[PDB]
Structures are given as C-alpha cells and as structure tokens.
Amino acid sequence: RKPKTGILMLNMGGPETLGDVHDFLLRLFLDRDLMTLPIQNKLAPFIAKRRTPKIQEQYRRIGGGSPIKIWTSKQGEGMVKLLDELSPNTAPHKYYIGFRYVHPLTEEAIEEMERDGLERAIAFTQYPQYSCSTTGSSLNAIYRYYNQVGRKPTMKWSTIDRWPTHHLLIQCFADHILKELDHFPLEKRSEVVILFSAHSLPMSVVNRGDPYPQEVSATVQKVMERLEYCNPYRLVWQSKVGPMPWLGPQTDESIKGLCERGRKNILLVPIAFTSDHIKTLYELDIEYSQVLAKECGVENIRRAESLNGNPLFSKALADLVHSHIQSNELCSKQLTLSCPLCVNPVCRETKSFFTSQQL
Amino acid sequence: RKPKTGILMLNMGGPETLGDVHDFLLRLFLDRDLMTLPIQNKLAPFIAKRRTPKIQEQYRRIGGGSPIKIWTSKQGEGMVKLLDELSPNTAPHKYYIGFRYVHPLTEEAIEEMERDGLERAIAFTQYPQYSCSTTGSSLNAIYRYYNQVGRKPTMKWSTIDRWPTHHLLIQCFADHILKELDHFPLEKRSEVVILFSAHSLPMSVVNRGDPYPQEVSATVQKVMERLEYCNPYRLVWQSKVGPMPWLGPQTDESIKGLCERGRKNILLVPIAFTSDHIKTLYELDIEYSQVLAKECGVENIRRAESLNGNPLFSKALADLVHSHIQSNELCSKQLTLSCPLCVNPVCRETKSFFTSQQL
Ligand SMILES: C=CC1=C(C)c2cc3[nH]c(cc4nc(cc5[nH]c(cc1n2)c(C)c5C=C)C(C)=C4CCC(=O)O)c(CCC(=O)O)c3C
Ligand SMILES: C=CC1=C(C)c2cc3[nH]c(cc4nc(cc5[nH]c(cc1n2)c(C)c5C=C)C(C)=C4CCC(=O)O)c(CCC(=O)O)c3C
Ligand SMILES: C=CC1=C(C)c2cc3[nH]c(cc4nc(cc5[nH]c(cc1n2)c(C)c5C=C)C(C)=C4CCC(=O)O)c(CCC(=O)O)c3C
Ligand SMILES: C[C@H](CCC(=O)O)[C@H]1CC[C@H]2[C@@H]3[C@H](O)C[C@@H]4C[C@H](O)CC[C@]4(C)[C@H]3C[C@H](O)[C@]12C
Ligand code: FES
Ligand code: FES
C-alpha cells in the first residue's frame, strides 16, 4: 500500500562514527538559527576543527558514536504501528527522520517524502519543549527547502511543533523517576534531591522571548505534580558551550553546590531529551555521575533512564499525531506568534508555510 | 474574642504616602536578601536619595501612595470570615500584615501576634511564586526576629511558603483575562497576544538556583491550560533596576517588539502580584499601555485587573490556610531544600525555625 501519511520526525541528530564529528560540528556551528555568532561563516570552521578532537574522544567513551538514530527509528516504528491502528483512515503511515546536522538531513527527508507521493506530511518535532534554536531551526529548514527550489509541496503540510506537557510524556518521566528512587538506599530516599537537567540556552536567545524555559518549567511542573512532590526538586541547565552568558544554574555547579551543602543523594532527569546520546551517556553519566560525583564525595547520584524504547513513549507519539489529525489544526496557537524581539526574517515566513495551508 | 490561630500575611509593602518613599527605598536597597549590591551600605543611601523624586512622582500620579495595605487588609478579612467557619476547631482567626519594608513590619506583626497570646502562628506568603528575594527574605525576617529578641516563640509556627498553581488562584487570573478579552474587538479576540508579565529577578539570583522562574512559569501553564490555549502567549518580565543583568525579555521591549512586528492587540497580566500597586497602576498602566503604546502605535493594549478584592481570592486564601492546618505540614517539601549554590547562612537557619515545630 502506497504511503498515505508521512510523519517527519525532527531532531538535531548526531555523529554516528568518530569520522562524522567534524562535518557535524561545522554544520551545527554554521547554523545562525541555533545561535548567532560574529562572522559565523569564518568562525564556525575554526570552532569545528579545534573542537572535533575532544568530542571524538567523548564519543569513543560511549561506544564510538551517538545512538540518536537507532533510538529515533525504534520510536517511529512503534509509532507507525499504533497510527496504522488508531487512525485507519489515514491509510499506511510512514515515519521519516529529519536530522538538522547529519545526513538523514531535513532536506533529504523532504525530497524522499515527495518521492513517495504522500498526500499528507506532518512536521513532528522531537523536542517536546519549543525553542527557536531547535524546533524553530528544523522548521525554517523545511520552509527553506521549498523556498530555494521555488516549488510548492505536492502534499498537505501540518505541524506538531511542541508538546511540553503531553500527559503520556509526563507519565514516562514520572515512572522512570519512580524506579530510580527505588534504587537509592531505602533510608536515604526522601533525602534524594531531583535535578531536572534541561539543555541550557544562550541568554541571547532566552532574552529575545524564546518559548523554551517556560515550557521546560511546565514539563517539570507536571512531572512533580504527578509524583505529588515526593521529593525536593530544582530545574537546572546543562551543556553550555563557549564564553557567552547562558541560562540558570549549570547542572555541574548545581550537583557540586548540593554535594558541598549536605545533599549527597541526587537523581538526574533528562527533562528535555527523548533518547540517550552524548548529553546523557557521557556528560551526565561520566562527567558528573563519575568524575564530579567522586571529587565532591557523593553518596548516591543516579539518573532516570531515557525514554528511548519505552513503549509508553511510542504510545504518546502516535496519540499526539492522532489528535493532530483529528484536530485538523495546521500548528499550535503559540507558533502563530513569533518571538517578541525576533530579528530572523525566515521565522515570519516559516509561519505562513503552515498557517497559510490548505486541507 | 481572642485570637486562637494567627495568619501572618507576608508581602513587600509599599509607601503609603510620598513622605514615606525615601526610607522605604533605603530599607529595600539595603536588604541583601532581596539583591546584592557592591558596597551595599554605601550605595543604598545614594540610590535611595537619587531615586526618591522620580518615585514620589510616580505615586503622585496614582493617588499619592500605594494601595497594597488597603488591598491586603480586605483580602485578609475575607480570609478570616471564611476560616472562622471552614475550620471552627482552629477557633478565632486573626490576620496580621507583615510588610518587609514598611509599617506593619514583619517584626511589629510578630510582636503583636505574640502579645495577642496566639496558639498557632502561620507564615502565609503573599508571593504565590517563591523567590529567595521575596518570600525568602520575609521568612528570614521572622527568624532574625526571635534570634534577636533572644527568646523562644510562645506559639507553634508553620509556613505556607508558596502556592504557584493553586486551583483557585488560577481561576481568578483565567477569569479576569476572559472579561478583558471581551473588551477587544470580536474579530481580533483570538489574534490578541497574552503577555504574562512577572516581576524580573537579577541573574545573580536566578543563576544561584532561585525557584521563582520555574515556579512563575508553572502558573502561566495552568492559566493557559484552563483557557485551553484560546490565545498566543509569552511570559515576559518587568521592573528591572540597575546596571546588572536581569532575567528574560523585558515587558517593555516585548510590547514595543510586538508592535513593530505587527501584533498590535495586547493583553498584559500581573502574574506575580496579588493586588495593584506601583508595578501595575503606574508601570504597566501609564508607562507602557499609555506612553509606550502611544508611540508604538498599538490597536488595543489592556490589562487584566489585579486580584484585589475578588471574593474568589479570599476563598483561595482560606482554602490554603485550612488545607495547611489539616495537612499538619510545617512547610513545603521545596523549602526543605535550599538553593544549590546558596551562600546565605540565614537560609539554613530559617529552614529550621519551621521544620522543628510542634504539632
Ligand atoms: C543555541 C544553544 C545550543 C547550542 C550552542 C548547542 C550546541 C550543541 N548541541 C550539540 C549536540 C546536541 N544538542 C542536542 C540538543 C539540544 N541542543 C540544544 C541547544 C544547543 N545546542 C537544545 C535546546 C537541545 C534540545 C533540548 C542534541 C540531541 C545533540 C546531539 C547528541 C548526540 O546525538 O550525540 C553539540 C555538539 C556537542 C559538543 O559539545 O561539541 C553542540 C556543540
Ligand atoms: C532583586 C529583585 C527585586 C528588586 C531589586 C525589587 C525592587 C523594588 N521592588 C519595589 C516595590 C515592590 N516590589 C514588589 C514585589 C516584588 N519585587 C520583586 C523583586 C524585586 N523588587 C519581586 C519578585 C516581587 C514579587 C513577585 C512589590 C509588591 C512592591 C510594592 C509596590 C507598591 O506597593 O507600590 C521597589 C520600589 C519601586 C521602584 O520602582 O522604585 C523596588 C526598587
Ligand atoms: C550593580 C552595581 C552598580 C555599579 C557598578 C554602578 C556604577 C555607577 N552608577 C553611577 C551612577 C548612578 N547609579 C545610579 C543608580 C544605581 N546604580 C546602581 C548600581 C550600580 N551603579 C543601582 C542598583 C542603582 C539604582 C537604580 C544613579 C541614579 C546614578 C546617577 C547618574 C548621574 O546622572 O550622574 C555611576 C557614575 C555615573 C556618572 O556619569 O557619573 C557609576 C560608575
Ligand atoms: C541603571 C542606572 C539608571 C537608574 C535607573 O534604572 O533608572 C544608570 C544611571 C547611570 C548609569 C552608569 C553611568 O552612565 C556610568 C557607566 C557608563 C558605561 O557606559 C556603562 C556602565 C555605567 C556604570 C552606567 C550603568 C547604568 O547605565 C547607570 C548606573
Ligand atoms: S527567533 Fe523566535 S520566531 Fe524568530
Ligand atoms: S538563597 Fe535560596 S536557600 Fe539561600
């Protein structure tokens, strides 16, 4: 049966092998939508080269590359299975991987979907909380694909641009948080502090009205209500890059400060991620949970596991897509409003791409 | 009768008359728990003297002083009338105004609470969203009072240190927002952008792990979930003072930014206050809505009205107190954990003068 409905899963993607680090970093640092940089065209290549070495080593420490693709596939296939059931009308569903900086690119995926004669195309961001640096960059990519070529899509487009508090996403974290707590020494459980560690963002993005911080906070809030405040929690931000100011307490300094102030049982939560990768397997698990945990004298530092293959997460993907169709909305109401202090001409256009759509 | 259970309402307070402005600012800029200033004891006076004229003028423009006490008084009586009924066992209830920088200072209030020979003393913060700079400072005052008076309290203390998503608090905002929308043209209603304007915080306080940011967001989410995303929204921050970096997008820049980008139908919302005062009557109402929107060339820019005398608000107060008394809680789980990068010796001590309470 010809693929009828296509769900394009968008995420950043990551180096599969150490040989893919450099090219990945070059594209990444060249992307002005992720973050603005002085003379990006020239600085990026410079940054990519100097950085490739240590990043390659990091990828070696965790296998030789990022698992993001494998996790994304497993998730989509499960999704399709359920879609091909919940919504029998939308005939066969086919998932498509659209990584921002690694072939399977967004452009290769669009080309591919068009080549399948799909009548429906759904841009489904894998970033639950919206940032103009992530979903906004993946979306502009979709828009640009058509703009540059100068042709209109042969399919109907719609987009699930965000899903901060999907009740099934929330249940996954809460659940994962309960089996972790269950493995801390019983007499130390109620002392464990829960650190939600969301990727951080330059203050240049946050200060321009970016939606991200608020929604991550929303995700954080739902989870804790679901766990009915069983433990103290704090929202911290990780993975800062470069000299410029970035948001809220860094996770590293937070784990350190807690440790030095009496709180030595910490539970980390990948609140803004959907699978394992360098950010968890190496940064949180090795850098903080091993090295930093050791230097400060942590009694127990554990990490709630990543959604990854959790069927309940697949359940959630499909449910979101299903509700999406049923609703016939072209995008979320929030998307129809660009950042208060936006200065990216593409944004306003990418917005039309989905709002000014038919069917 | 004679009070049995005392509800000490905590808020910053405000200059009742133009004559009270100078010393109000001196106290405020000296309070290191609010925000830290270089050579504080020297700078505070300078700042206060230089800032007074401008601020007296602002009060003049809105009545010659602040409403905060009147408002707080009415909310308290309403809370009392309900508490004396919802929870008769807690017998007579008396509310005391505990203003951080002006008369019924936290100390004076504690003083007459003790004198009224109460049995139960409850610290009820009028800051729905917890920040060390606000509730944190007010709580620190309660602690420093006894510790300075050199005597043990003659009544059981407990605290309601935060209530960011209390069901009824959300119903007042959601409601006020709806009737404000009704004053907008009908074929624009859904085009109106809702700007939840909270008081901003210095990054110095945010980067230390302050609960406020994430907490304020949690309120926004609830409000919008209740309004089932009828309109586009953005959480921005107002009231920065001084040269140092402060949090997120400024309400002003956000307003002017929306105009220049076309969105000229705006609804402001005091998501962190519980009554009107200089932050709304003057800043939002005259400085942005009038003066700023003037130039900007805006359609309609209105503001939901402050909670003030809303009966539902008194219910919220009463429902929180009563619910607090039943839970037999001494404070929130969140208060039992100080900031990850906390460097204030008082904090730790304040957490004791609440968690080490009888009954
Ligand atoms: C504008 C601010 C951001 C910058 C500058 C940024 C930078 C990076 N993000 C990377 C990888 C990544 N970033 C990722 C999700 C996010 N990244 C985010 C925001 C940013 N991410 C946000 C927000 C994300 C979602 C919550 C993912 C998923 C990877 C890939 C991990 C992998 O597969 O190994 C890498 C490669 C790592 C390294 O240390 O060299 C950089 C440099
Ligand atoms: C370090 C961060 C903060 C600073 C430096 C701060 C400064 C002030 N807050 C004031 C008044 C006030 N601030 C107030 C609630 C808050 N203020 C807050 C955070 C701060 N508030 C937060 C957070 C609040 C609650 C969400 C209130 C209620 C007033 C009283 C206004 C009145 O009654 O007229 C005034 C006097 C007004 C003026 O503009 O000169 C200053 C200088
Ligand atoms: C954060 C640490 C601060 C530093 C390093 C600081 C530095 C300065 N503040 C100045 C002036 C001033 N600072 C002032 C209010 C504040 N200043 C503040 C915080 C600081 N202010 C805060 C907080 C204020 C409250 C709003 C005022 C009112 C002036 C007067 C400027 C003038 O017109 O001369 C000047 C000198 C201006 C000149 O041209 O003579 C300096 C160098
Ligand atoms: C922020 C404050 C205005 C008071 C207010 O908020 O109304 C203004 C008044 C004087 C200003 C300062 C003075 O112009 C002196 C300095 C000039 C430098 O170019 C920036 C820092 C510098 C140290 C300024 C920081 C800040 O813009 C100040 C302190
Ligand atoms: S940067 Fe957010 S809409 Fe343009
Ligand atoms: S500053 Fe927050 S607990 Fe000390």
mmCIF file of C-alpha atoms and ligand atoms in Angstrom, chain A residues 11-15 24-25 28-29 34-35 51 55 58-59 66-68 127 131 133-134 199-202 205 212 241 246 272-273 277-279, ligand 1:
data_model
loop_
_atom_site.group_PDB
_atom_site.id
_atom_site.type_symbol
_atom_site.label_atom_id
_atom_site.label_comp_id
_atom_site.label_asym_id
_atom_site.label_seq_id
_atom_site.Cartn_x
_atom_site.Cartn_y
_atom_site.Cartn_z
ATOM 1 C CA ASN A 11 15.738 16.355 15.931
ATOM 2 C CA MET A 12 19.279 17.591 15.830
ATOM 3 C CA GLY A 13 20.874 14.237 15.192
ATOM 4 C CA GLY A 14 24.483 13.368 15.975
ATOM 5 C CA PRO A 15 27.760 11.816 14.683
ATOM 6 C CA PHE A 24 28.520 17.588 12.153
ATOM 7 C CA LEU A 25 30.174 20.366 14.126
ATOM 8 C CA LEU A 28 25.990 22.929 13.696
ATOM 9 C CA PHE A 29 28.163 25.996 14.318
ATOM 10 C CA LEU A 34 20.689 27.659 16.659
ATOM 11 C CA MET A 35 22.776 30.562 17.898
ATOM 12 C CA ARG A 51 36.596 21.101 18.922
ATOM 13 C CA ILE A 55 34.374 15.463 21.076
ATOM 14 C CA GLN A 58 33.855 11.667 24.129
ATOM 15 C CA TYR A 59 32.072 9.641 21.521
ATOM 16 C CA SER A 66 25.678 8.656 19.004
ATOM 17 C CA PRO A 67 22.710 6.298 19.411
ATOM 18 C CA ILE A 68 20.244 9.053 18.460
ATOM 19 C CA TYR A 127 11.900 18.458 21.032
ATOM 20 C CA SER A 131 12.992 26.832 21.278
ATOM 21 C CA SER A 133 17.119 27.267 18.465
ATOM 22 C CA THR A 134 15.797 23.750 17.981
ATOM 23 C CA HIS A 199 19.724 21.628 27.873
ATOM 24 C CA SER A 200 20.736 25.257 28.519
ATOM 25 C CA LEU A 201 20.436 28.211 26.103
ATOM 26 C CA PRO A 202 22.476 31.327 25.442
ATOM 27 C CA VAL A 205 18.147 33.548 22.821
ATOM 28 C CA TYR A 212 11.779 27.160 25.797
ATOM 29 C CA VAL A 241 29.112 25.984 25.038
ATOM 30 C CA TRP A 246 23.923 31.083 29.410
ATOM 31 C CA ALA A 272 14.253 17.978 27.555
ATOM 32 C CA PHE A 273 15.622 14.892 25.725
ATOM 33 C CA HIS A 277 23.301 10.423 23.458
ATOM 34 C CA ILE A 278 26.366 12.422 24.302
ATOM 35 C CA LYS A 279 24.341 14.663 26.627
HETATM 36 C C1 LIG C 1 21.642 27.549 20.931
HETATM 37 C C2 LIG C 1 22.113 26.684 22.086
HETATM 38 C C3 LIG C 1 22.708 25.313 21.783
HETATM 39 C C4 LIG C 1 23.969 25.103 21.396
HETATM 40 C C5 LIG C 1 25.028 26.184 21.185
HETATM 41 C C6 LIG C 1 24.131 23.707 21.231
HETATM 42 C C7 LIG C 1 25.268 23.108 20.876
HETATM 43 C C8 LIG C 1 25.479 21.793 20.661
HETATM 44 N N1 LIG C 1 24.489 20.822 20.708
HETATM 45 C C9 LIG C 1 25.183 19.656 20.394
HETATM 46 C C10 LIG C 1 24.561 18.428 20.291
HETATM 47 C C11 LIG C 1 23.227 18.145 20.546
HETATM 48 N N2 LIG C 1 22.344 19.105 21.040
HETATM 49 C C12 LIG C 1 21.159 18.415 21.191
HETATM 50 C C13 LIG C 1 20.021 19.003 21.689
HETATM 51 C C14 LIG C 1 19.835 20.324 22.066
HETATM 52 N N3 LIG C 1 20.822 21.294 21.934
HETATM 53 C C15 LIG C 1 20.193 22.456 22.356
HETATM 54 C C16 LIG C 1 20.794 23.704 22.286
HETATM 55 C C17 LIG C 1 22.086 23.996 21.865
HETATM 56 N N4 LIG C 1 22.975 23.005 21.497
HETATM 57 C C18 LIG C 1 18.853 22.182 22.792
HETATM 58 C C19 LIG C 1 17.842 23.158 23.385
HETATM 59 C C20 LIG C 1 18.622 20.876 22.606
HETATM 60 C C21 LIG C 1 17.326 20.156 22.971
HETATM 61 C C22 LIG C 1 16.781 20.262 24.388
HETATM 62 C C23 LIG C 1 21.305 17.046 20.774
HETATM 63 C C24 LIG C 1 20.240 15.941 20.770
HETATM 64 C C25 LIG C 1 22.579 16.878 20.373
HETATM 65 C C26 LIG C 1 23.158 15.572 19.850
HETATM 66 C C27 LIG C 1 23.606 14.493 20.789
HETATM 67 C C28 LIG C 1 24.140 13.253 20.137
HETATM 68 O O1 LIG C 1 23.411 12.658 19.340
HETATM 69 O O2 LIG C 1 25.281 12.870 20.405
HETATM 70 C C29 LIG C 1 26.579 19.939 20.200
HETATM 71 C C30 LIG C 1 27.757 19.078 19.898
HETATM 72 C C31 LIG C 1 28.467 18.961 21.239
HETATM 73 C C32 LIG C 1 29.764 19.492 21.577
HETATM 74 O O3 LIG C 1 29.971 19.691 22.764
HETATM 75 O O4 LIG C 1 30.560 19.760 20.690
HETATM 76 C C33 LIG C 1 26.734 21.241 20.356
HETATM 77 C C34 LIG C 1 28.079 21.979 20.224
#
